[PDB]
Design a binder for this molecule. Sequence first.
Ligand SMILES: [Cl-]
Ligand SMILES: [Cl-]
Ligand SMILES: [Cl-]
Ligand SMILES: [Cl-]
Ligand SMILES: [Cl-]
Ligand SMILES: [Cl-]
Ligand SMILES: [Cl-]
Ligand SMILES: [Cl-]
Ligand SMILES: [Cl-]
Ligand SMILES: [Cl-]
Ligand SMILES: [Cl-]
Ligand SMILES: [Cl-]
Ligand SMILES: [Cl-]
Ligand SMILES: [Cl-]
Ligand SMILES: [Cl-]
Ligand SMILES: [Cl-]
Ligand SMILES: [Fe+2]
Ligand SMILES: [Fe+2]
Ligand SMILES: [Fe+2]
Ligand SMILES: [Fe+2]
Ligand SMILES: [Fe+2]
Ligand SMILES: [Fe+2]
Ligand SMILES: [Fe+2]
Ligand SMILES: [Fe+2]
Ligand SMILES: [Mg+2]
Ligand SMILES: [Mg+2]
Ligand SMILES: [Mg+2]
Ligand SMILES: [Mg+2]
Ligand SMILES: [Mg+2]
Ligand SMILES: [Mg+2]
Ligand SMILES: [Mg+2]
Ligand SMILES: [Mg+2]
Ligand SMILES: [Mg+2]
Ligand SMILES: [Mg+2]
Ligand SMILES: [Mg+2]
Ligand SMILES: [Mg+2]
Ligand SMILES: [Mg+2]
Ligand SMILES: [Mg+2]
Ligand SMILES: [Mg+2]
Ligand SMILES: [Mg+2]
Ligand SMILES: [Mg+2]
Ligand SMILES: [Mg+2]
Lengths: 171, 171, 171, 171
Amino acid sequence: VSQVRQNYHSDCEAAVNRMLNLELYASYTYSSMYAFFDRDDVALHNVAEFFKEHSHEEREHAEKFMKYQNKRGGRVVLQDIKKPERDEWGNTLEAMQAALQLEKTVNQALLDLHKLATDKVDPHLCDFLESEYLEEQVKDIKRIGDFITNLKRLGLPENGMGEYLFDKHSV
Amino acid sequence: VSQVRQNYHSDCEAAVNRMLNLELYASYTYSSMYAFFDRDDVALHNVAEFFKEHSHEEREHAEKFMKYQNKRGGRVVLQDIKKPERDEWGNTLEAMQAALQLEKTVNQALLDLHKLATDKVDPHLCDFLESEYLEEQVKDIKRIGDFITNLKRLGLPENGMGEYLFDKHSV
Amino acid sequence: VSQVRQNYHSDCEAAVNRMLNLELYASYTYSSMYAFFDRDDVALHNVAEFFKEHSHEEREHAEKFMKYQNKRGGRVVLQDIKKPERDEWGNTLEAMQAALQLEKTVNQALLDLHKLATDKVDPHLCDFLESEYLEEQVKDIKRIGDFITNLKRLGLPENGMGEYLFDKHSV
Amino acid sequence: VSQVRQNYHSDCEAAVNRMLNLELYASYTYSSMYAFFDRDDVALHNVAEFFKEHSHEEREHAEKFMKYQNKRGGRVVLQDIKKPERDEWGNTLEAMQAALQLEKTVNQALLDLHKLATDKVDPHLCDFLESEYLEEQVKDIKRIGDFITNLKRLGLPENGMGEYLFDKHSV
Ligand SMILES: [Cl-]
Ligand SMILES: [Cl-]
Ligand SMILES: [Cl-]
Ligand SMILES: [Cl-]
Ligand SMILES: [Cl-]
Ligand SMILES: [Cl-]
Ligand SMILES: [Cl-]
Ligand SMILES: [Cl-]
Ligand SMILES: [Cl-]
Ligand SMILES: [Cl-]
Ligand SMILES: [Cl-]
Ligand SMILES: [Cl-]
Ligand SMILES: [Cl-]
Ligand SMILES: [Cl-]
Ligand SMILES: [Cl-]
Ligand SMILES: [Cl-]
Ligand SMILES: [Fe+2]
Ligand SMILES: [Fe+2]
Ligand SMILES: [Fe+2]
Ligand SMILES: [Fe+2]
Ligand SMILES: [Fe+2]
Ligand SMILES: [Fe+2]
Ligand SMILES: [Fe+2]
Ligand SMILES: [Fe+2]
Ligand SMILES: [Mg+2]
Ligand SMILES: [Mg+2]
Ligand SMILES: [Mg+2]
Ligand SMILES: [Mg+2]
Ligand SMILES: [Mg+2]
Ligand SMILES: [Mg+2]
Ligand SMILES: [Mg+2]
Ligand SMILES: [Mg+2]
Ligand SMILES: [Mg+2]
Ligand SMILES: [Mg+2]
Ligand SMILES: [Mg+2]
Ligand SMILES: [Mg+2]
Ligand SMILES: [Mg+2]
Ligand SMILES: [Mg+2]
Ligand SMILES: [Mg+2]
Ligand SMILES: [Mg+2]
Ligand SMILES: [Mg+2]
Ligand SMILES: [Mg+2]
């Protein structure tokens, strides 16, 4: 047992490792979206940079879980980072839709981890999730939903002018 | 009943008073460690100052509980501050080991208070503990554990050169 | 065919994708080393931060290949990022030895890519590798070799005092 | 023989003169595009200025070859600068398409010169091309391709509103 370990359940330690992997997976998906929008035959650079920024954000989320694991006396265990679901992302609307679903998947995993922490009576882990993850997640989901509403308003996927306008005025 | 009192259980009020006393006890133990490392036949001044700083931190923790008690309409009840367990602390490793155990004792009391607050459905007290105590406690425990690992690496208790090096490069 | 594509062989495009994956793999290995040295029972924070910085450097190398691929009209194709070879890294010497071998593996892949680019008469790709990768790689290999020499001098793996001194004066 | 001349093949000297002429030709084509978009019945001033800037860039490329020729002890030999292929450029999409093809023509000539320099074992000329020409060429081709993708997205040539929007938000 680690000398620092106190009130930290094995199940929570394992779930933190799985959560870490999911954050890395989300980062990698966003990296893929960046590369797609940077293609010469897609060429929506502000959209590309939005996804690149999100990729970095998700990596930071993962690193914060590594730090957390060690602070509690748990042990970081890494697994493969699976490649993203798609190799190409269609257009701004399809990508934003995929991002919304990804964000909700990550959110569900965070909420499940919070429930586990609650069941194991771990208020430190609860606080960590509430203070560092859950609100940023709600904010991100709201921003992406707002974007989707606007992309539909702008006539996506068919309206190329609408897609151009979004890239130039929303991101 | 205090005019401000709302959703504050008698059991929680009493437990806050006991927690206050424990913080003062921890402060006093750290004061003792400061005085020991300041001895001419011990003479590890950076180590002494580390413990002096922790003594002040613990006193601040106690004062914050006094303020909390009054904010909720509870009444501060003081008891004797018991003298520390030891009069002399051996060396840097023994002292850090004692500090780790003290920090875990304080942490357990905070977690027990959080459980009581949860049982009495007191979210304000839960928030207070999570926002002002529980994370600082985890951070402090991690720092002391890290120190112990390094002190063992440096050959404590036997290696006096190792002890000197720690005082000059870690604190 | 991409409208921008000129003098860019399919073999080079594929090799750039494989190189990208290797950079990500190297990043992930360094992330693992960071987490290990951040453990409470390892606790060499300057060493941890060295590896964390290298993890970020390798990610930047990967992103630069993504940008390169698109600039030439190639298409980014991502694969799984394999987890690192080890879950724990022994000590500073073992980790630095693993880092040296990793850096040489990455260097060999860069040199192989340069040879392919030479065979396909692609001076732009040659220039990119020479200007952005090959010298940084030689510099990094030299720095790590220098560290290993010093760690051996300091009596690693047995000499814990030597390991402490390295963390406090070399990184 | 020039007193400075060393490892400079007659074939490379002649090819540098031809390359110089091509840069001047490219400059002149861009000047024509500037004048077209400045017409009162075309009136896309940001597009005009983009081409004017490129005209100046190409002239600078030519001047750098003159300087290069003298540095190696070769002799600058000038030929007529042929007028551009067209007197009018249709619209933003047609012009960008012509610019892409022009840039690829210039790029091919640079790559051919690099191959000649390689065959004649002239690393100074290789370095000059790689360091001063080849990457700027790839960057320019990528930018123009990105523009074409966006112009098509915006409904060019038919969509006049799309053309206006491009002029006001992309250049
Ligand atoms: Cl535990
Ligand atoms: Cl507990
Ligand atoms: Cl457990
Ligand atoms: Cl696990
Ligand atoms: Cl009450
Ligand atoms: Cl209530
Ligand atoms: Cl009560
Ligand atoms: Cl009481
Ligand atoms: Cl090609
Ligand atoms: Cl070619
Ligand atoms: Cl090919
Ligand atoms: Cl591939
Ligand atoms: Cl010569
Ligand atoms: Cl020679
Ligand atoms: Cl000759
Ligand atoms: Cl000539
Ligand atoms: Fe995340
Ligand atoms: Fe996210
Ligand atoms: Fe305290
Ligand atoms: Fe404390
Ligand atoms: Fe790298
Ligand atoms: Fe590297
Ligand atoms: Fe040029
Ligand atoms: Fe050009
Ligand atoms: Mg376990
Ligand atoms: Mg998973
Ligand atoms: Mg798979
Ligand atoms: Mg918050
Ligand atoms: Mg009472
Ligand atoms: Mg007590
Ligand atoms: Mg007594
Ligand atoms: Mg709560
Ligand atoms: Mg907090
Ligand atoms: Mg291919
Ligand atoms: Mg590979
Ligand atoms: Mg495997
Ligand atoms: Mg070069
Ligand atoms: Mg260089
Ligand atoms: Mg001649
Ligand atoms: Mg010509
Ligand atoms: Mg003619
Ligand atoms: Mg360059």
